[PDB]
Amino acid sequence: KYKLVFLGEQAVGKTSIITRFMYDTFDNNYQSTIGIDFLSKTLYLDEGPVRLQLWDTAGQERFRSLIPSYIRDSAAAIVVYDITNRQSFENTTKWIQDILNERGKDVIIALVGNKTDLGDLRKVTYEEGMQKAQEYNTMFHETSAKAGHNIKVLFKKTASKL
Numbered sequence: 001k002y003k004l005v006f007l008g009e010q011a012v013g014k015t016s017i018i019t020r021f022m023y024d025t026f027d028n029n030y031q032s033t034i035g036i037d038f039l040s041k042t043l044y045l046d047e048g049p050v051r052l053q054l055w056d057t058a059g060q061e062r063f064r065s066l067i068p069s070y071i072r073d074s075a076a077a078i079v080v081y082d083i084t085n086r087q088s089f090e091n092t093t094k095w096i097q098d099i100l101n102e103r104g105k106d107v108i109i110a111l112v113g114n115k116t117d118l119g120d121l122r123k124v125t126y127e128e129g130m131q132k133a134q135e136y137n138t139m140f141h142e143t144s145a146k147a148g149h150n151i152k153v154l155f156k157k158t159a160s161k162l
């Protein structure tokens, strides 16, 4: 079993990405919520099966004292932002630092730009996201939980190198 924690500002798409991967579905009528959740899934890689334990967190500032417990013992950490929201992107550094403080080098980190189906509303370029990821040597991906685009490769890459 490997603990994968999802971090990021409220409403960027953490719950939706997780749902998309778990049941390959999307709630088009889903109106943002506050809460935490745990879900695990087994992925079969051309090397053997890998059990993943996904932690869906609550990123609002009022829950900051819970961050250490979110990240503790994690094998991987996904920092998610919204490509249409500049402020959610500016906060990625904060989340990446929380990860480094708590786990140092013993964790795989991935930076994800979500909501790629709203390209017309993009406020953060792919370039910017990629540079941030390169600054901290993390993985970089842009996804769309709504359309269900480029999400499976994210979990496959994490489950493979970990």
Ligand SMILES: Nc1nc2c(ncn2[C@@H]2O[C@H](COP(=O)(O)OP(=O)(O)O)[C@@H](O)[C@H]2O)c(=O)[nH]1
Residues within 6 Å of the ligand: 008, 009, 010, 011, 012, 013, 014, 015, 016, 017, 027, 028, 029, 030, 031, 032, 033, 114, 115, 116, 117, 118, 143, 144, 145, 146, 147
């Ligand atoms: N257009 C679009 N909306 C999305 C996408 N992912 C999530 N959303 C919507 O954005 C809102 C916030 O998503 P949610 O998963 O609750 O965010 P969380 O706070 O990170 O868990 C919801 O109303 C979702 O339906 C996406 O890829 N595209």
Ligand SMILES: [Mg+2]
Residues within 6 Å of the ligand: 014, 015, 016, 033, 034, 035, 056, 057
């Ligand atoms: Mg959520």
